[PDB]
Structures are given as C-alpha cells and as structure tokens.
Amino acid sequence: SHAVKIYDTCIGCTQCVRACPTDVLEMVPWDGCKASQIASAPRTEDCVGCKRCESACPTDFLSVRVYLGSETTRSMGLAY
C-alpha cells in the first residue's frame, strides 16, 4: 500500500480530501492553523496513488505527500 503523510504546513483547505477518488483522506480537528482542521489519511489501503491530492494542495511545499509503496489489488486499481 502507498504511504500518505500530512505535514504541519496544512492550512485545512479540504481540497485534497475533495480531490481524492478513493476516500483515503479526511479532515480532523486541529489547532495548528487558522481553519482549525488538518488533513488525515486513515485509509491508505485504498490509496491508488493518483496524486490528485498533491495537485490540489496549495501550500509550498506540499502538505500532503504520497509515497508509492508495495502494490496490491486496490493500489493497482484492478477490477479483475
């Protein structure tokens, strides 16, 4: 499965969660940013690795990072 990490530069804009096609990400309460929320990745076993979340992230550098790892049926996006 791929590894998705969230770094503390996240501004809680929820764009990565909205961009995710497999529901890997969600917003949890936080206090390190003005929006009082941070992204989290509790379901990385469903991560395909499309990096739509990184395309959606506005911070510089990225607050959400996807590291491609070992490939399973879910991560390879196989319907067969």
Partner 1 sequence: WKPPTLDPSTPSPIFGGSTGGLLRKAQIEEFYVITWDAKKEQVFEMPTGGAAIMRSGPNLLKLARKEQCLALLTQLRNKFKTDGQIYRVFPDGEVQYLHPKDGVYPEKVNAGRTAVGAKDRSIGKNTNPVAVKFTGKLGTYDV
Partner 2 sequence: KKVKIVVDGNPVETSFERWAKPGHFSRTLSKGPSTTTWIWNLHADAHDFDSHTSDLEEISRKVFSAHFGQLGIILIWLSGMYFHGARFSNYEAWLSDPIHIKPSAQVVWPVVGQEILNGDVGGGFQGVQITSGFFQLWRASGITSELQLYSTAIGGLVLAAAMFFAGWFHYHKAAPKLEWFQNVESMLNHHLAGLLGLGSLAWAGHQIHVSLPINKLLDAGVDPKEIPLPHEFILNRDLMAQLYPSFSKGLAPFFTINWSEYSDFLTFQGGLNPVTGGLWLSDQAHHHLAIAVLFLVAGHQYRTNWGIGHSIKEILEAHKGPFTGEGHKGLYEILTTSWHAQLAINLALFGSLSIIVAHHMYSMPPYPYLATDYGTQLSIFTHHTWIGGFCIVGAGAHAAIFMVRDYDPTNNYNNLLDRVIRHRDAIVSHLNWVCIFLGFHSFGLYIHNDTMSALGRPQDMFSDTAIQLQPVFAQWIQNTHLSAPQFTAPNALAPTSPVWGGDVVAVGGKVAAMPITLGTADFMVHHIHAFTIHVTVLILLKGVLYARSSRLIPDKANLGFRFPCDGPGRGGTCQVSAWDHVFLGLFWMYNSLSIAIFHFSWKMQSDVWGTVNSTGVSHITGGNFSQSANTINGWLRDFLWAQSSQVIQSYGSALSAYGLIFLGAHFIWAFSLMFLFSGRGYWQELIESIVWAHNKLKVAPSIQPRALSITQGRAVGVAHYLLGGIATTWSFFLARIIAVG
Partner 3 sequence: RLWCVQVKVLRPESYWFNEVGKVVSVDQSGIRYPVVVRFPTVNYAGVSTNNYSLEEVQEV
Q: Which residues contribute to the site for ligand SF4 (CB under 6 A)?
A: 4, 6, 10-16, 19-22, 24-25, 39, 47-53, 56-59, 63-64, 66
If you compute the radius of gyration of the chain from its CA atoms, what whole number of angstroms results? 13
Tokens of 56: 């959606």
| Cβ pair 62, 34 in contact under 8 A | no
According to CB under 8 A, which one of 21, 28, 45, 59 is a site residue for partner 3? 59
The option from ligand SF4, partner 2, partner 3, none interacting with 16 (CB < 5 to 8 A, set by class) reads ligand SF4
Give the CA distances from residue 65 to residues 17, 28, 40, 79, 80, in Å, rounded to whole numbers and listed in that order.
13, 17, 11, 26, 28
Of the pair 44, 64, the CB lying nearest partner 3 is at 64
In angstroms, what is the minimal distance from the CB of 57 to partner 1? 11
Q: Which is nearer to ligand SF4, 55 or 80 (CB)?
A: 55
